[PDB]
Structure 1
Amino acid sequence: MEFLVEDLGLVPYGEAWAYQKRVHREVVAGNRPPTLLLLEHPRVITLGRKATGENLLFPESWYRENGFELYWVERGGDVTYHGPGQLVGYPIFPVGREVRRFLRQIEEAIVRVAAGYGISAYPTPGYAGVWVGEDKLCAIGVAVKEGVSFHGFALNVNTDLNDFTVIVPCGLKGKGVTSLEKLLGRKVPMEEAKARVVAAFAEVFGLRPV
């Protein structure tokens, strides 16, 4: 009937990852409610289950020399970027076997958040994540272990979208990437985007936020 929200603020990817795993273990054990972590990461490139070297334009060494951290991870999808201004959410929820349903619920929540800003977004029939026309507003890539999810979504609020140009997604996709800031012509407060996400998750999952 409830989910717990934790706002971690700005946290390094590696430490936040360790925290994900600790939270996950507690949810698996039935010792913590379904938990939504909200946060930002310092500039980082991550490479998921479908990622290869072709997803990086430059060598890995270039990224680290130019202010990115870089990690290989077990979430769905290929390469992505997280950085300041991007609202990263890790719903660590007891989803059981129904992963596709869970993805659709994350998508629905993000579509609702966009609608709150007057923005028409959609999952699309063919591309992972949530899109506004031909541009990706929110990336989504999860992992599920012992029936509990981790990783999650990355909503571009005030992201430096130029940072996506150095990575090269593979497979079926639209043309570009976008953010609330780009769509609206002004920065949107991160505190507000977090609040809107919590409300959307509450509505979609039918749970009370604590």
Structure 2
Amino acid sequence: MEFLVEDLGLVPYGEAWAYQKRVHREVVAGNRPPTLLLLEHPRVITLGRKATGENLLFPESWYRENGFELYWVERGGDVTYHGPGQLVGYPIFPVGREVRRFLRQIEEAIVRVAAGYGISAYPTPGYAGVWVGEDKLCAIGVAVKEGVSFHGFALNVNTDLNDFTVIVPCGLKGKGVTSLEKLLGRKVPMEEAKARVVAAFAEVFGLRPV
């Protein structure tokens, strides 16, 4: 009936990952409610299950020399970027076998958040994540272990979208990336974006936030 929200603020990717794993263990054990972690990461490139070297424009060493951290991870999708101004959410939820349904629910929650800003967004029939026209507003890539999810979504609120240019997604996609800031012509407070995400999750999943 409930889900727990934890706002971690700004957290390095590696430590946040370790925290995801600890939260995940507790949810698997039935010793913690379904938990939505909300946070930001310092500039980082991650490479998921479908990622290859082709997804990096420069060598890995260039990224580390130029202010990015870089990690290979087990979530769905290929390459992505997280940085300040991007609201990262990790729903660590007991989804069982129904992962496709879970993805659709994350998508729906993000579509609701965009609608709250007067923005028409859609999952699209063909591209992972949530899109506004030809541009990706929110990336989505999860992992599921022992029936509990981790990783999650990355909603561009005030992201430096220029940082996406150095990575090269593969497969079916639209043309670009966008953010609430870009669509609205002004920065949106991160505290507010978090609140709207919590409300949307509460509505879509039918759970009370604590």
Report deviation, 1:145: 0.1
CA distance in 1, matches of 2:167, 2:129: 17
Count of matched residue pairs? 210
Q: What SS is found at the alignment partner of 2:154?
A: strand
TM-score by length of 2: 1.00
Report deviation, 1:125: 0.0
- Which whole-Å deviations, capped at 9, do the CAs of 1:80-119 have from their partners, x for residues lacking one? 0000000000000000000000000000000000000000
- Which whole-Å deviations, capped at 9, do the CAs of 1:26-57 have from their partners, x for residues lacking one? 00000000000000000000000000000000
Cα RMSD after superposing both structures: 0.0
Residue ranges of structure 1 left out of the alignment (5+ in a row): none
Report deviation, 1:130: 0.1
Report deviation, 1:144: 0.1
CA distance in 2, matches of 1:100, 1:17: 23
Q: Is 1:148–2:148 an aligned residue pair?
A: yes
Report deviation, 1:58: 0.0
TM-score by length of 1: 1.00
Report deviation, 1:202: 0.0
CA distance in 2, matches of 1:17, 1:174: 29
- Which whole-Å deviations, capped at 9, do the CAs of 1:45-75 have from their partners, x for residues lacking one? 0000000000000000000000000000000
CA distance in 2, matches of 1:57, 1:100: 31
CA distance in 1, matches of 2:144, 2:3: 18
Q: What SS is found at the alignment partner of 1:64?
A: helix
CA distance in 2, matches of 1:136, 1:149: 23
Q: Is 1:112–2:137 an aligned residue pair?
A: no
Residue ranges of structure 2 left out of the alignment (5+ in a row): none
Report deviation, 1:6: 0.0
- Which whole-Å deviations, capped at 9, do the CAs of 1:133-184 have from their partners, x for residues lacking one? 0000000000000000000000000000000000000000000000000000
Percent identity of the aligned residues?
Answer: 100
Report deviation, 1:194: 0.0
Report deviation, 1:204: 0.0
CA distance in 2, matches of 1:37, 1:73: 18
CA distance in 1, matches of 2:108, 2:121: 10
